[PDB]
Amino acid sequence: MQALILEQQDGKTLASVQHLEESQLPAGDVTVDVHWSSLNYKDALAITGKGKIIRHFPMIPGIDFAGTVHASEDPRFHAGQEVLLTGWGVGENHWGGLAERARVKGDWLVALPAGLSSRNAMIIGTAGFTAMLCVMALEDAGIRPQDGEVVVTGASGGVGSTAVALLHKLGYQVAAVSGRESTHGYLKSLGANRILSRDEFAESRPLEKQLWAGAIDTVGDKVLAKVLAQMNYGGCVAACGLAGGFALPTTVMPFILRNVRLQGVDSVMTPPARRAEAWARLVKDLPESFYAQAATEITLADAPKFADAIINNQVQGRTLVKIK
Amino acid sequence: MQALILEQQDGKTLASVQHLEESQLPAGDVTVDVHWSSLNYKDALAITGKGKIIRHFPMIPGIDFAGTVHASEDPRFHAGQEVLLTGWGVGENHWGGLAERARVKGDWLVALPAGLSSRNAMIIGTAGFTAMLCVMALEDAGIRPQDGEVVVTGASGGVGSTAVALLHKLGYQVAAVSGRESTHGYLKSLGANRILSRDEFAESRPLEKQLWAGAIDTVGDKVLAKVLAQMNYGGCVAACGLAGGFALPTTVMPFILRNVRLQGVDSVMTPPARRAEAWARLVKDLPESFYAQAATEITLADAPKFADAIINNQVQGRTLVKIK
Ligand SMILES: NC(=O)c1ccc[n+]([C@@H]2O[C@H](COP(=O)([O-])OP(=O)(O)OC[C@H]3O[C@@H](n4cnc5c(N)ncnc54)[C@H](OP(=O)(O)O)[C@@H]3O)[C@@H](O)[C@H]2O)c1
Ligand SMILES: NC(=O)c1ccc[n+]([C@@H]2O[C@H](COP(=O)([O-])OP(=O)(O)OC[C@H]3O[C@@H](n4cnc5c(N)ncnc54)[C@H](OP(=O)(O)O)[C@@H]3O)[C@@H](O)[C@H]2O)c1
Numbered sequence: 214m215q216a217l218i219l220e221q222q223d224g225k226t227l228a229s230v231q232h233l234e235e236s237q238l239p240a241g242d243v244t245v246d247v248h249w250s251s252l253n254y255k256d257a258l259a260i261t262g263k264g265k266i267i268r269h270f271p272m273i274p275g276i277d278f279a280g281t282v283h284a285s286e287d288p289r290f291h292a293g294q295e296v297l298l299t300g301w302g303v304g305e306n307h308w309g310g311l312a313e314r315a316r317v318k319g320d321w322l323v324a325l326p327a328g329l330s331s332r333n334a335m336i337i338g339t340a341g342f343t344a345m346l347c348v349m350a351l352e353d354a355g356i357r358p359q360d361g362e363v364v365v366t367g368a369s370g371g372v373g374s375t376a377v378a379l380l381h382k383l384g385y386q387v388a389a390v391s392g393r394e395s396t397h398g399y400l401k402s403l404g405a406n407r408i409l410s411r412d413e414f415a416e417s418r419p420l421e422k423q424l425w426a427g428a429i430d431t432v433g434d435k436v437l438a439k440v441l442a443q444m445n446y447g448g449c450v451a452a453c454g455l456a457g458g459f460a461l462p463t464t465v466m467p468f469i470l471r472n473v474r475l476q477g478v479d480s481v482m483t484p485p486a487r488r489a490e491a492w493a494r495l496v497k498d499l500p501e502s503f504y505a506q507a508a509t510e511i512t513l514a515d516a517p518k519f520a521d522a523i524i525n526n527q528v529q530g531r532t533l534v535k536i537k
Numbered sequence: 538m539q540a541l542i543l544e545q546q547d548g549k550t551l552a553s554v555q556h557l558e559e560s561q562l563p564a565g566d567v568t569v570d571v572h573w574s575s576l577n578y579k580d581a582l583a584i585t586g587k588g589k590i591i592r593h594f595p596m597i598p599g600i601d602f603a604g605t606v607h608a609s610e611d612p613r614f615h616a617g618q619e620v621l622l623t624g625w626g627v628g629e630n631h632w633g634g635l636a637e638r639a640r641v642k643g644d645w646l647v648a649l650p651a652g653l654s655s656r657n658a659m660i661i662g663t664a665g666f667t668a669m670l671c672v673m674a675l676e677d678a679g680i681r682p683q684d685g686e687v688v689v690t691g692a693s694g695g696v697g698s699t700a701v702a703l704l705h706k707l708g709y710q711v712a713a714v715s716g717r718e719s720t721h722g723y724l725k726s727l728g729a730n731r732i733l734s735r736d737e738f739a740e741s742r743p744l745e746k747q748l749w750a751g752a753i754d755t756v757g758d759k760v761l762a763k764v765l766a767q768m769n770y771g772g773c774v775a776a777c778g779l780a781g782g783f784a785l786p787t788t789v790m791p792f793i794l795r796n797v798r799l800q801g802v803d804s805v806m807t808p809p810a811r812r813a814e815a816w817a818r819l820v821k822d823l824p825e826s827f828y829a830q831a832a833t834e835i836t837l838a839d840a841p842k843f844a845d846a847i848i849n850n851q852v853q854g855r856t857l858v859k860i861k
Contacts, residue, residue: 419783433789446806452792459743461792463785465757468776468801475799477792482770 216312217516219259220271226262228274228517238316239308242286245296245317247278248331250310251338252511252519252532253371254456259304260520266305275310276303276481277338278536279331287319295325297492299339300481311516313536323488328496336508336533337495340371343480344429345491345498347372347451348379350476351427354449358384361426361445365389366414366436367456368405369396369529376429377403378503385427390414390436396529402506414439419466427451434458442466444473453478508533540636541840543584543596550586552598552841563632565640566611569620571604572655574634575662576840576856577695578780581847583628584840590629600627601662602634602860603655611643619649621658621816623666624805635840637860647812652820660832660857661819664695667804668753669815669822671696671775672703674800675751678773682708685750685769689713690738690760691780692729693720693853695831700753701727702827712749714738714760720853726830738763743790751775758782765791765799777802831855 218231238244258264259274267274279297282290290296301321303309308316325331337345351363363380367373368389380387381404389400392411400408417439424443430436431454440450441463452475467473483491507530511519522528542555562568582588583598591598603621606614614620625645627633632640649655675687689700692713704711705728713724716735724732735756741763748767754760755778764774765787776799791797807815831854835843839858846852 433793437789446803452789454793455789459788459790461785461787461789463787464783465761465776465779465785465801466783468799469757469778470803470805471801472803472806473801475792475801477789477795477797477799479770479794479796481794483796484771 214313215513216273217275217513218271219262219267219274226260226267228260228520230514235314238314241316241318243290243317243319243322244283244285245278245280245315246283247280247310247313247315247536249280249335250275250278250534250536251335252516252523252534253277253339254523255339256304257520257523260517261524263524269306273308273312274304275312276300276305277335278310278315279325279334283314285319290319290322290324295331296322297325297331297334298322299342300483302481311513311534311536320485323492326492326496329492332533333504336504336531337375337499338371338531339480340531341375341495341499342491343453343478344372344375344379345495346478346480346483346487347376347429347453348383349491349494350451350478351429351449354427354474354476356427356449358386362386362388362424363427363429364425364440365429366440367431367454368400369393370431370456371531372431372453374403374507374530375499375503377405378500378507379498380404382498382500393526399529403503411436417442419464420470423471430454432457434460435462437461438463441473441475444471446471447473449474449476451476451478453480507531510535538637539837540597541599541837543591543594543598545586545594550584550591552584552844554838559638562638562640566643567609567614567641567646568607569602569604569639569641570607571602571634571637571639572861573603573659574599574858574860575601575659576843576847576858577601577663578778578847579663580628580635581844584844585848587848593630597632597636598628599633599635600624600629601659602639603649603658604639607638609643613643614646619655620646621649621655622646623663624807626805635837635858635860647816650816650820653816656857657828660828660855661699661823662695662855663804664855665699665819665823666815667777667802668696668699668703669819670802670804670807670811671700671753671777672707673815673818674775674802675753675773678751678798678800680751680773682710686710686712686731686748687751687753688749688764689753690764691755691778692724693717694755694780695855696753696755696777698727698831698854699823699827701729702824702831703822704728706822706824717850723830723853727827735760741766743788744794747795754778756781758784759786761785762787765797768795768797770795771797773798773800775800775802777804832857834859
């Protein structure tokens with residue numbers, strides 16, 4: 214079998230496609246013939262050797278994959294069945310998606326839903342699944358299209374792009390925040406009602422003027438701090454990222470004076486039930502047009518190059534990896 | 538009529554009980570003969586001139602009151618009716634409850650709930666109403682007694698005492714955090730199962746060991762930051778306070794890695810349906826023993842002295858003001 218393999222020569226990560234035997238695969242009760250994977254921000258860090266994502270080498274990266282079951286000892290899954298996986302430590306501490314074959318716990322798999330192609334599941338990937346979870350968080354908080362504008366940060370990215378399209382489809386007025394001017398036409402076509410510059414969110418008072426009924430944040434750090442200060446009374450922010458930094462230098466004022474909810478969204482260990490629900494919602498809520506707009510398809514050996522482009526913020530939308 | 542009056546000579550607030558004519562009260566549809574009020578942290582800030590709570594002088598402070606309607610131009614209220622009020626800006630921008638009479642909008646009043654005495658309504662006051670809103674937030678998040686331990690910070694105070702008593706009644710295992718060894722017996726008597734020192738909430742990593750299914754925070758600052766770092770995956774913190782400072786020096790990690798919810802709770806502008814629900818729940822969920830254990834009854838003339846004690850963290854439980 215072939216696989217993208219991370220090894221460490223002199224402490225610096227080297228990535229290259231290599232042949233290896235199925236016998237080397239980690240233990241698990243389901244074996245999957247992988248047809249598609251993707252590159253997420255976390256995959257890019259893993260591949261660039263940045264971020265301390267990988268604590269064991271050599272490692273097959275890729276926190277995502279979709280394919281067909283080769284063999285299964287889990288009674289929920291049968292040989293030939295179409296399945297997908299995102300998260301659960303896969304591609305971090307367990308051999309990953311960017312390989313022709315993977316062996317995992319059946320607990321980590323999701324049956325490919327009726328209404329979603331294996332290829333499109335990967336275009337969504339971890340990033341899109343996370344966006345769906347964020348949207349469901351706003352809904353849980355009672356945030357409706359009629360309540361006001363929803364703001365999306367890091368909007369041109371994988372999570373951001375998906376969130377814009379989901380919110381647009383669901384009827385919300387969407388404001389997209391982006392540090393790049395080249396992404397504007399793209400963002401408008403995704404459904405953004407207006408585009409705002411990243412520099413507009415540098416520093417804030419504890420409370421700013423109320424602007425947002427809802428927010429989906431991929432940035433963290435000072436951007437998230439300012440969004441919080443700008444939330445309408447009873448607004449909700451769904452936070453999932455740290456593209457701008459992991460710190461959260463905020464105050465309790467939006468919370469105790471404006472009754473704001475900050476809902477954290479984790480994709481790695483999302484419970485099976487909510488996980489299944491998110492995938493079913495994606496079938497319903499993501500327009501077929503999104504898949505053509507947001508995706509760039511690459512081959513396995515091109516991953517390191519794109520990993521680099523992702524870290525340097527030189528891409529927009531989602532990176533789909535054909536594994537075949 | 539008699540009322541506690543706040544005036545500032547030169548950037549400093551002066552508080553004294555004075556006699557005034559009823560005709561000096563602000564305009565409003567409902568005139569109430571006040572029988573009870575209370576002192577909350579916010580009232581103590583107002584009365585001591587700290588916290589920029591009052592921007593208009595002279596002011597009659599007191600964000601709570603309970604009494605009997607003398608006259609009403611509002612068709613929802615009638616002469617002789619028992620009513621209570623918390624919040625709505627009363628005691629901040631509108632002459633408030635620390636007086637023999639108050640005049641207010643019908644919208645700000647709550648008919649005295651069946652089963653609740655006027656005196657007990659004020660032992661509860663804003664502090665207890667807030668604790669109830671915090672408990673309801675944990676419930677909204679699906680935090681059940683079987684799910685794990687709930688921590689209450691600033692536990693010996695007004696909101697904290699009520700919170701401990703409510704959670705205890707509802708069947709939770711409760712941990713109380715206090716910076717005063719002298720409050721431990723009192724906290725145990727309210728139903729706290731575990732008592733921890735505030736000293737243990739001074740430094741923290743972005744993620745600490747997972748300890749709490751839920752939390753009710755009245756302190757903010759570092760204590761809140763560490764509580765966030767200690768939340769179980771999917772845990773919820775209901776935050777309502779700033780006794781320890783208004784800053785929130787935290788990181789996105791508990792949110793994006795552990796799916797934590799931080800729900801802000803405001804008592805001031807709580808809409809009528811939720812506000813009515815909270816009062817109904819309080820009547821049901823606070824044991825009779827609570828009113829006896831938590832309350833210290835003072836007269837209006839004692840208010841300034843007690844406001845000092847509150848700000849100096851030299852009181853425990855709830856301060857009840859007999860106005861009648
Ligand atoms: N389980 C989880 O909570 C989970 C799951 C998926 C993703 N994430 C996190 O969510 C974030 C987004 O992931 P992704 O895969 O969408 O990433 P991405 O496509 O690589 O980029 C996200 C966007 O963030 C913006 N950005 C990048 N650097 C920035 C900076 N220094 N300051 C402000 N904005 C910056 C860029 O948008 P613009 O150029 O338009 O400004 C970029 O397109 C990442 O931090 C990722 O690790 C977490
Ligand atoms: N969100 C809202 O609409 C609203 C409504 C009501 C109350 N509040 C806020 O909630 C908080 C509690 O109100 P309350 O009436 O219960 O006040 P309280 O009776 O004074 O309780 C505050 C408690 O915090 C602890 N504390 C005091 N100073 C501290 C410090 N410097 N560092 C760490 N802990 C400290 C003390 O407990 P220990 O001695 O046991 O440590 C004290 O009992 C206040 O900040 C108040 O403004 C907000």
